[model samples]
Target: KIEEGKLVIWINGDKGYNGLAEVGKKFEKDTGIKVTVEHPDKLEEKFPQVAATGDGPDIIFWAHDRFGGYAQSGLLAEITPDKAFQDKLYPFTWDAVRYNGKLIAYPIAVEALSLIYNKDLLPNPPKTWEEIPALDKELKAKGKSALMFNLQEPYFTWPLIAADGGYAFKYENGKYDIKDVGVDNAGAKAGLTFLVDLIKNKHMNADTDYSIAEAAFNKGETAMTINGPWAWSNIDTSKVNYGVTVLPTFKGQPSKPFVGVLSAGINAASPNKELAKEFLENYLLTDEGLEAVNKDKPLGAVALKSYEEELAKDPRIAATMENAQKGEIMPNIPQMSAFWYAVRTAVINAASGRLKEKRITNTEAAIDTGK
Candidate 1:
């Protein structure tokens, strides 16, 4: 039996802390161990500094992307789940938390973008990118666009690049080769060209930013919009009867969105290793534990496959799960910092058709061809 002691857990926001507070109470009651929850501003930035001083929280809750950097810095404990526990989660869940072949965190939630459509406007969503233009033509009569999204954002735009076989970094041999950038390859150009044509033909515009696209969709001004599970909170379901599905195909290939995982990690230097591990493995990962974490925030796509069918009872969650299953994880390497700005510039430049400077096109070609 675990002895009585105090455990500190640092969480990110009010939502996150609320999710865990009840679970902490249950843990304390059962194990006679007090659990203290702290919501620190900028926990990601403060974690490393506090952890190095050997006075950090026993566990940290945050996105999996930062786990790699934390692991590399020797701040995270190497987690080795049992075979039974390993089989209980999705394969991608493992991929998201693993750094250099060792698991550094326990996956909690998963998220991905999907094509959310107004069911009343388009009884059926498009199956491929080609169907969009025809649908746009039909919808134009009603002053509605076929599809709307934040065209300038890299997270939303990367799906087009992937569908056309372009990538920020060439992932190979169980690792990513940062040197092999593929942002400007022929595939990427084709993808961007399609988007450019949409703008030139007045199907969409560069100014259709997040607010515009979201407002348009919520107000029933657009037939379809691409967004993730988080968008559900702002959407007034009573105003618009909407449905979501994985992104449509582009050039016959599925447009894959980036999958982001929310995870919990154990600090390597924490004196409460045994207690922390027990709380995580015995309590937090269980169905009951997950229920507490998800009580406030109903993550549509959860990492635990065992609970998928249960969570799928909610259509919103089900659609998000389907899209997440078909998505790709973002590279967490430091090199990704440079990749984001460069790729966004390429998309904006291509959409505007003002490639006079050729900086964006040139960057694309260099990254695409490695020339």
Candidate 2:
């Protein structure tokens, strides 16, 4: 059991974590409990070992995607925040933090991909993906691409597939059925075909990676790019006048990006469960605390409704929240790892025309075999 008069927390020292650290001081002072915040270099790799030793943190600040693995390992603490506290959070936020219908964490921040465009270049933003080719033709004279994104990454690619009615898995009976993979569906093929055409026609390139895409957008070499709020730090407003909006429609369907939530989960082994719970409910989930954490970071959206309306006023946050409303929540099952790597490889191969069979066939093979 941990010593009395102390609380331990672990975070990766990002902007969100730094905000938590600031609040930890106030919590410590108010309760006279020593708050220890540790920043590990490789949190994902090291957390399991630390948690196994029972020296793990009372609270772990991380993404919801990894909560499933932690909870399955018997390492997460079940939480029951009071009605007032629970009512403050979005329903989807609670759903994201649950494992097997049991609450596992307190959801904090959320992110989603949106079309970030150069306001100067796109005076009237394209409302549909159909307009991209024509926009590209007009922009080509000025040496700029209409749109660009990370071609090698599946996270960005999935939205295109989703816009075409393809999904990674089917959600049924309150859980995702991974056995029903949709990477090779008709919609997926259509999306893949369109993606390949952009490459073949030189409107976009297979070599355009995330950094390249961001740089292109920042330098005004691209009129628009698919990105999340996190990329805001990389942009310089002096050089690029940007505006964020929901991604354009794909064949009449709204482009649905994957939504990710940042959350705080308690370690099951911590001796200070009551204190940790109190800290989360009274401090971390409150308007003052949430505002502090978002001060510098400015999350795309927060789970707490009190700040949500104020946050949505910013177009950047509004665009992200809009896409999130239309997007699918990221599946946090352990099987997701296989889906990510396999689908990403298939997308790369298809984009480069290295796939021997049809893009959809290659994608299905990858999903089936997880190669």
Candidate 3:
């Protein structure tokens, strides 16, 4: 009993506005199936109550982190793109959409942090952390800082911490061993220590944050900053001659960024499952569809291969995508919930010298107590 022309989709932060209407119209034109997008309030609360009873939105638009729970609860229908087009997708994006090796969603876009530099000042961006000191010395001569970012932010610092060898949890066979936490490992210590020293040496200030750092970069006062694609819009309009690239190597090993995906999934109980899949896999992910979504949402670093030409023309998005290709999917398990606060606080404390205790040794201790 499928309703041919009635399909409802719920976005996580649905404001009752259909930003997807642009793409929805295209789907309706070709398939004669009218799709409605809604911003249901308290979606996280409403989704389970309705979906588990086999009654809810036909599709759900949300971040990939929530997929593990939805799939395990049998609320989302599994999605396997036809082999013909599966090969056209990025492996990392595909990896994010899966739970237990089975695809459960459609990845819409990807995001990751990368090194953004001032081409006029650096001439050539650094390839490793070892070059930072020299660059700092040169920048100091010109009354400037070579590099800057929120010193206490783990999201920004993880590339260095995981550069050598470290992780938030024990990942094996594509699953996280939640009981085993590795925040206090040698690699994290090395990474944190590097930032602490940066504060002590006056290369960057303890008060530096994303806004302050971006302000500095925008004013052409900082030569480099580690940021994500979200900053492209802001940086692209600045007067600095900017260049984007992967994170500098920490030692000899290349840095690894944290990759996150925003995606859409179908409800397992939906009667129009095939139509929903067609809407997602065939039409929603089309180059035109993605661009339409990009107009509404700054789709930083698109996951589809259709943007290589566009990305090549824009290095900022290209570097963000390149960094994502080298990055690991941010763990999707619930265990990762506390990682943000623990790591962020540790970095802030370390940078501010507010009794900066241990590197990651103390990090796991805090997380163990549910910090």
**True-structure lDDT of candidate 2:** 0.80
What's every prediction's RMSD, in angstroms?
Answer: 6.2, 6.0, 7.3
Off by over 4 Å in 2: 1-17, 28-58, 173-175, 233-239, 269-279, 356-371
Model 1: lDDT to the true structure:
0.78
Q: Residue 334 in model 2: shift from native, Å?
A: 3.3
Q: What TM-score against the true fold does each predicted structure earn?
A: 0.73, 0.81, 0.71
How would you order the candidates by TM-score, starting with the best? 2, 1, 3
Taken over the whole model, the C-alpha lDDT of each candidate is: 0.78, 0.80, 0.76
lDDT of 2 by residue, 242-345 (tens): 88888999989999898889888888888888999888888877888887767645567888888887777787897898998898888777676667766787
Worst 10 residues of 1 by lDDT: 357-366
Write out the backbone clash pairs for model 2: none
Error of 2 at 264 (Å): 1.6
Candidate 3 per-residue C-alpha lDDT over 87-184 given as tens digits, one digit per residue, 9 for 90 to 100: 76788788888778798888877777889899888889988987787789888998898998866457788888778776777889955787776566
Q: Report clashes for each candidate as comma-separated counts.
A: 1, 0, 2
Model 3 lDDT, full chain set: 0.76
Where does candidate 1 stray beyond 4 Å?
Answer: 1-63, 80-92, 137-143, 172-175, 200-202, 205-212, 233-239, 267-279, 292-295, 312-326, 331-334, 348-371
